Amino acid sequence: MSIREAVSVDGTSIVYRVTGNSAGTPLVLLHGWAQSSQCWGEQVLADLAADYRLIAVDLRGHGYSDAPESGYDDSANWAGDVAAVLAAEGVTENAILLGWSYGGLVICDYLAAHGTGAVAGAVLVGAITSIGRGEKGGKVGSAMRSAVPGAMSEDPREAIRALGAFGNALTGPPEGKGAASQALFGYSLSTRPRVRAALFNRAVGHDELLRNLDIPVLVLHGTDDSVVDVSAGKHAEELIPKSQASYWVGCNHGPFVEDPTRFVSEVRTFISSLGKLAGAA
Amino acid sequence: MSIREAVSVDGTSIVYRVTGNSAGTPLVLLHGWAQSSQCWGEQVLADLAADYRLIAVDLRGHGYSDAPESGYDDSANWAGDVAAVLAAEGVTENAILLGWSYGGLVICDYLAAHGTGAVAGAVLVGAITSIGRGEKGGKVGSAMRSAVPGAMSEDPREAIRALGAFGNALTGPPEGKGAASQALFGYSLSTRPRVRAALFNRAVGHDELLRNLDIPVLVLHGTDDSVVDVSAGKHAEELIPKSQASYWVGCNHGPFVEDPTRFVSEVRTFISSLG
């Protein structure tokens, strides 16, 4: 059975999808603000599930997960969500955590709370790692600044208008990708407005964690990301001791949409890099 | 776990959510075109789960269910989806099947294939029972007509305009209904465009089933439904020997959205009445 749920520390049910090879390295996918476990694209999901035990999570308040009334500003709830998924799957080591945008912050809340015992590597895709004034890891782009707080309203007129401030930032050039462009706008619309707001009504700084991670981390980030400034990825690269970076020239916030083959290729190479094969060649 | 899946006759996974007491009467909820198990609204789903073993299904191609390339024009697939969910839950008798819009057609496909041995009653909410030219039980309204083929387009601009306009017939007001309006619109947009098209590109008639049905069926339909014309429900009421009906004056296609309390009440009473 592919679709499952785990109960976090506050009693929130967190829905997730497990696909791929049972024997393979666990790859946990954490999506971004006002999206879902369906954002990644069918081709990306199919390709990653070939080698990995693929675990695609619906963040609290998103997708099919429970939407509690409060607690979105508590790092311990986010941490408990990832811990609970990992435990339900019996994952105690070697996991790869991948986070898009807000997913990066979820990973950091989790690593801040549990350390790196269960984890061999992480991938930060157009990710924030902090939120708040002066947080270089939390630097948003112009599109996101026009989109908020109108994108948080329950008023459809305002929410539709505001979310169009994103333009094509999620997809890049949208030709031939209309279904995906529709679906991404859709997930944001069906994310409860109160959840959309609660996610950014918080502050947390994680630079001290970044400087002390003992795991390899790939920073994968569009140079033209108008949602999360590429400066945030560059900051993570600068602070993380075992960082690797791939900056996609001309790419916006959705590299997995703009070039699903390249995205899969870069993630597979990263994960394979964590063994002893590179040493051999 | 509340969230689950069942494997249909063609290998399609059908995701569904179970809530409420496992000893209650099973109530299967089957949503409409381009929607999902989340359409019904939190209060409606909480109130129904207070009394029933609530089974909220994502149709094939919708929500989190698999989306096969083809087969949406084959009644035996839809029938297997419903059988597979029932089997997975151990329901062999006494189920209530509730169908919103296209969900009515899914129910009829299932009943024709399988009979009513597992089923005590049905509810047809703004429902079609047939589809295609000349089927009085598939009579579509002005909002549905205007929405095609824009709502089937790969092109975002075209689909967003068509489905945005379409969504207003689902909510009615929409003053007071902003979040649901957004969410219904979002579920339609996130439904793959090829699935939106596939569902519509078929023909099947069930008048012979309806006039022969051996279960009580409630017809619950807005008089100003502009998605599925009220005449479709008036037609089903006429054919079904043990029909009951409730025509909500001034209501469009979404009664559970327009008046969640009334919707739950009318459903409870019908189900209670099965005695």
Q: Determine the strand fraction of chain A and express it as a percent band.
A: 15-25%
Rounded to the nearest angstrom, the distance between the terminal CA atoms of chain A is 39 Å
The protein's oligomeric status is homodimer
CATH architecture level-2 label of chain A = 3-Layer(aba) Sandwich
Which series of helices and strands of chain A comes N to C?
Answer: EEEHEHEHEHHHHHEHEHHH
> How does the major sheet of chain A shape up?
8 strands, mixed
Reading off the top of the CATH hierarchy, the class of chain A is best stated as Alpha Beta
Largest interface: A-B, 31 and 32 residues
Explain how this protein is built.
2 copies of one chain form a homodimer. In chain A, helix 2 crosses helix 3. Chain A has 12 helices and 8 strands. In chain A, strand 1 (3-7) and strand 2 form a beta hairpin. The first copy, chain A, has one domain (1-281): Rossmann fold. The longest helix of chain A is centred in the N-terminal third of the chain and has 14 residues, at 75-88. Chain A has 281 residues and is an alpha/beta fold. Chains A and B meet through strand 1, strand 2, helix 5 and helix 6 of A and strand 1, strand 2, helix 5 and helix 6 of B.
Question: Would you spell out the secondary-structure blueprint of this structure?
Answer:
2 copies of one chain form a homodimer.
Chain A: E1 3-7, E2 13-20, E3 26-30, H1 42-51, E4 53-57, H2 75-88, E5 95-100, H3 102-114, E6 119-125, H4 142-147, H5 156-164, H6 178-189, H7 193-198, H8 207-212, E7 217-222, H9 230-239, E8 243-248, H10 255-258, H11 260-272, H12 277-280
Parallel strand pairs in A: 3-4, 3-5, 5-6, 6-7, 7-8
Antiparallel strand pairs in A: 1-2, 2-4
PDB class: hydrolase
Keywords: alpha/beta hydrolase fold, hydrolase
Assembly: dimeric
